[PDB]
């Protein structure tokens, strides 16, 4: 549209496009997650719920391989039973909503695999810096 | 003065000195930014405003090259139209207040350049780890 050619616009703008196109625009959805006599209690619980959700996401990232790299290759493999589709097809064929509908079942085992991989990398790096 | 020779004292102590001298003392101004029946609402909104400002600054850093490195060389160049002064003169001649008065206009374009540089470095690293 207006943002054709130079593929960007405001936040949630890439939500209709494919995940390969949406992958280049991730900084703003990360950005619009933190900033934005009894109603002050509602305002305050909204603000602390926002920062609690943001801190939970940053802590989930920080126990994995990437603190704030925002794109993280890692060392866990991929069970092809989960995706069971053509690999380059999904980056030109699927939205993130449809992909999250696909791997709704295959969740919460990935995160423990990430934690095991990160702790294994940490003990391997501890041994490597220990014997040197 | 008292802190002559070993150039350090408490926070905002280097604010009068030049920016080259003040650059060695940055950990405490970073430190004194977070810690410190209706008045509890005032205390609480002060505390959550403090942590909201600190989280906005840490997120602004985290989308750039440095998560918590506190001194970050990066890959964007410098337009000499902005500073238009002798380079080694400003580290022995200017305070941070005067420097912030100088580049007040030249702001908010630097941050988008930093974001473009970091996203370009991320896609280059993704390609580099992809073809290997």
């Amino acid at each position, epitope marked *: 549209a207006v943002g054709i050619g130079a593929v960007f616009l*405001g936040f949630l703008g890439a939500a209709g496009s494919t995940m390969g196109a949406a992958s280049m625009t991730l900084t703003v959805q990360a950005r619009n997650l933190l900033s934005g006599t009894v109603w002050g209690i509602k305002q305050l619980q909204a603000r602390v719920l926002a920062v609690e959700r943001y801190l939970r996401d940053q802590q989930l990232l920080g126990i994995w391989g990437c603190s704030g790299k925002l794109i993280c290759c890692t060392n866990v493999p991929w069970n092809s039973s989960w995706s069971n589709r053509n690999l380059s097809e999904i980056w030109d064929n699927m939205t993130w909503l449809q992909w999250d509908k696909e791997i709704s079942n295959y969740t919460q085992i990935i995160y423990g695999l990430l934690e095991e991989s990160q702790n294994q990398q940490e003990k391997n790096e501890q041994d490597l810096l220990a014997l040197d | 003065a008292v802190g002559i020779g070993a150039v350090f004292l408490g926070f905002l102590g280097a604010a009068g000195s030049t920016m080259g001298a003040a650059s060695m003392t940055l950990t405490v101004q970073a430190r004194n930014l977070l810690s410190g029946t209706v008045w509890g609402i005032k205390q609480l909104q002060a505390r959550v405003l403090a942590v909201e400002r600190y989280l906005r600054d840490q997120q602004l850093l985290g989308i750039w090259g440095c998560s918590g490195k506190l001194i970050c060389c990066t890959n964007v160049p410098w337009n000499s139209s902005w500073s238009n002064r002798n380079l080694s003169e400003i580290w022995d001649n200017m305070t941070w207040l005067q420097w912030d008065k100088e580049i007040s206009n030249y702001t908010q374009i630097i941050y988008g350049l930093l974001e473009e540089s970091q996203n370009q470095q991320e896609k280059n690293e993704q390609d580099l780890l992809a073809l290997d």
Partner: nanobody
Amino acid sequence: QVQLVESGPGLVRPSETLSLTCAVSGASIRTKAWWSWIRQPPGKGLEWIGYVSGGWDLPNYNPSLKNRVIILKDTSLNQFSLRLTSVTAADTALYYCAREGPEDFDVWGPGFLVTVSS
């Protein structure tokens, strides 16, 4: 229902810093849009100067404009401003503020002749 109106000089000396400012009503600035500046030398075709975005795009200009064009948005005043440093008398042109959207430049400004003369 959007309405764009330019403001600024139409008569400036060459080798100076030119600057216009287009006010926007009828809609919001921070939309799926490129608030753009497009010019036209008199009797000749159009010349697209550049744009800025209400999102977080970096502004991208025509490289023929020789990096002297800085379009700066003012979301607190619903405006966006053209700049042109070191002008010449051959840069005399009708100037236009416009809005690229899902359709192509629907609401323009009226377009004012900046006649650069010494």
